[PDB]
C-alpha cells in the first residue's frame, strides 16, 4: 500500500496513470506495418545486423498464423529484410513514449526545448523498458499481442545469446520480477536524466530525477522485505546505467546501417538527429 509520503504516492499514481493511458499492451492499434517481402562499412553493418536474429509470427483474429524465418547472411541485401518492419514497430513504440511523457506534469512543466532534448535522449531506453514487460524469458519471445518476436535458437544456446548486451539486459531485467510501479519509475528516471545532449534546465531535471529515484528506493523499502530483493534499488540503478550504454551502442549501429541502407522513419530521423539533407 504505502510507507511513502503523499507526494511520493501521488508521483507514482501520475506515472502509473500515464502508463495506463499510453501503453497499448495488446498492440491493438499497431497496423499498416511493412513486412519482409514475399566498403569496410558493410563488414561492420553485417556484424551489426546479425547481432539480433528473430523469427516473426502473426496470429490472425480468425485463428490463422503467419510465420517468418529470416535468411542467413549470404553476402547481400537480404540482411535488410526486417528493417522496414522493425522501423514501423519502433515508430509505434516511440509514439507511445512521447504520449507518456506529454501527460506527465513534471514533464509538461519543462521548457519545450528540454522536452525535445529529454525525449531524443531517452526514447530508446523507455522503449526497451516497455518491451521488457512483454518479454517472455522462458520462450525467448517478445509477446506483442498478435505479433511475436522469437529469438532464433542458435549454436551456443541461451548463454551465447546473453553475450549480446541487449539480450543480456532483457533476461537480467526480467529476472528481477519488477512491479508495474517499478518499471514506470525506471522510465521516469531514464526520461529525467539531466545530462542528455542539449538540456538547459540541468538543475531542475536533476532534482526531478532524484525525487523519482528516492520514490523508487522508498517504494522498494516499504513493499519488498524479502532477502531476494536486497540491493534491488541498486541493481535497478545499475541496469539503467547499462541501458544508457546499450542506447549509445545501438544509436551507432543505427547510424551506420542508415548510412548505407536508409530505412529510418521520419519520427526516427527526428529523434536521432537526421535533418533530411
Ligand X SMILES: C[C@]12CC[C@@H]3c4ccc(O)cc4CC[C@H]3[C@@H]1CC[C@@H]2O
- Answer yes or no whether residue 168 interacts with ligand X by CB under 6 A: no
Q: How far, in Å, are 48, 51, 80 from residue 257 at the CA level?
A: 8, 13, 9
Shorter beta-carbon distance to ligand S65: residue 204 or 267: 267
**Per rule CB under 6 A, count of chain residues that contact ligand X:** 12
Binding to ligand S65 by residue 86, rule CB under 6 A? Answer: yes
CB burial of 106-129 (b: ≥16 within 10 Å; e: otherwise) equals: bbeebeeebbebbbbbbbbbbbbb
Q: Could you say which of ligand X, ligand S65, none residue 131 binds, taking C-beta under 5 to 8 angstroms by partner kind?
A: ligand S65
Q: Is 202 annotated as a binding residue?
A: no
51 near ligand X (CB under 6 A): yes
Kindly state whether residue 149 participates in binding ligand S65, applying the rule CB under 6 A: yes
Binding to ligand S65 (CB under 6 A): which residues in 39-58? 52, 54
Q: Is 128 one of the annotated binding-site residues?
A: yes
Position 131 contacts ligand S65 (CB under 6 A): yes
Piece in contact with ligand S65 (CB under 6 A), picked from 39-47, 85-93, 108-116, 173-181: 85-93
Q: Does 250 show up as a binding residue in the annotation?
A: yes
181-190 core/surface letters (b: 16 or more CB in 10 A; e: else) = bbbbbbbbbb
Q: Which of residues 88-117 bind ligand X (CB under 6 A)?
A: 90
Site for ligand X in 238-267 (CB under 6 A): 250, 253-254
Among ligand X, ligand S65, none, the one that 54 touches (CB under a kind-dependent 5 to 8 A) is ligand S65
268 binds ligand X (CB under 6 A): yes
The candidate with the shortest Cα–Cα distance to 24, out of 127, 124, 93, is 93
Q: What is the DSSP string of 226-246?
A: SGGGTTHHHHHHHHHHHHHHH
SS3 labels along 95-146: HHHHHHHHCCHHHHCCCHHHHHHHHHHHHHHHHHHHHHHCEECCCCEEEECC
Task: Pick the stretch among 22-30, 43-51, 102-110, 233-241 that binds ligand X (CB under 6 A).
Answer: 43-51
Residue 165: CA count within 13 A, CB half-sphere: 13
First to last CA, the chain: 53
Minimum distance, C-beta of residue 51 to ligand S65, in the bound complex (Å)? 9
> What does the H/E/C string look like for 173-213?
HHHCCCCHHHHHHHHHHHHCCCCCCCCCCHHHHHHHHHHHH
Binder among 4, 49, 122, 213 for ligand X (CB under 6 A): 49
Q: State the number of CA atoms in the 13 A half-sphere of 91 facing the CB.
A: 20
Residues that bind ligand S65 (CB under 6 A): 52, 54, 86, 89-90, 127-128, 131, 142, 149, 166
Q: Which residues are annotated as a binding site?
A: 90, 128-131, 250
Residues that bind ligand X (CB under 6 A): 48-49, 51-52, 83, 86-87, 90, 250, 253-254, 268
Q: Which residues are annotated as a binding site for hyperforin?
A: 90, 128-131, 250
Amino acid at each position: 500500500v504505502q510507507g511513502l509520503t503523499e507526494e511520493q504516492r501521488m508521483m507514482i499514481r501520475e506515472l502509473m496513470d500515464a502508463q495506463m493511458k499510453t501503453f497499448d499492451t495488446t498492440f491493438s492499434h499497431f497496423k499498416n506495418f511493412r513486412l519482409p517481402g514475399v566498403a569496410a562499412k558493410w563488414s561492420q553493418v553485417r556484424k551489426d545486423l546479425c547481432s539480433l536474429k528473430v523469427s516473426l509470427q502473426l496470429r490472425g483474429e480468425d485463428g490463422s498464423v503467419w510465420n517468418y524465418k529470416p535468411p542467413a547472411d549470404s553476402g547481400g541485401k537480404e540482411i535488410f529484410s526486417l528493417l522496414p518492419h522493425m522501423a514501423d514497430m519502433s515508430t509505434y513504440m516511440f509514439k507511445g513514449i512521447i504520449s507518456f511523457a506529454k501527460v506527465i506534469s513534471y514533464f509538461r512543466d519543462l521548457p519545450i526545448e528540454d522536452q525535445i532534448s529529454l525525449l531524443k535522449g531517452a526514447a530508446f531506453e523507455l522503449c526497451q523498458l516497455r518491451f521488457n514487460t512483454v518479454f517472455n524469458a522462458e520462450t525467448g519471445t517478445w509477446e506483442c499481442g498478435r505479433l511475436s518476436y522469437c529469438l532464433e535458437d542458435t549454436a551456443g544456446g541461451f548463454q551465447q545469446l546473453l553475450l549480446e548486451p541487449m539480450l543480456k539486459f532483457h533476461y537480467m531485467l526480467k529476472k528481477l520480477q519488477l512491479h508495474e510501479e517499478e518499471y514506470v519509475l525506471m522510465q521516469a528516471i531514464s526520461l529525467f536524466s539531466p545530462d542528455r545532449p542539449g538540456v538547459l534546465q540541468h538543475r531542475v531535471v536533476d532534482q526531478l530525477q532524484e525525487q523519482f529515484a528516492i520514490t523508487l528506493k522508498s517504494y522498494i523499502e516499504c513493499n519488498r522485505p524479502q532477502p531476494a530483493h536486497r540491493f534491488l534499488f541498486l541493481k535497478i540503478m545499475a541496469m539503467l546505467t547499462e541501458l544508457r550504454s546499450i542506447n549509445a551502442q545501438h544509436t551507432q549501429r543505427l547510424l551506420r546501417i542508415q548510412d548505407i541502407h536508409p530505412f529510418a522513419t521520419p519520427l526516427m530521423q527526428e529523434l536521432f538527429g537526421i535533418t533530411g539533407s
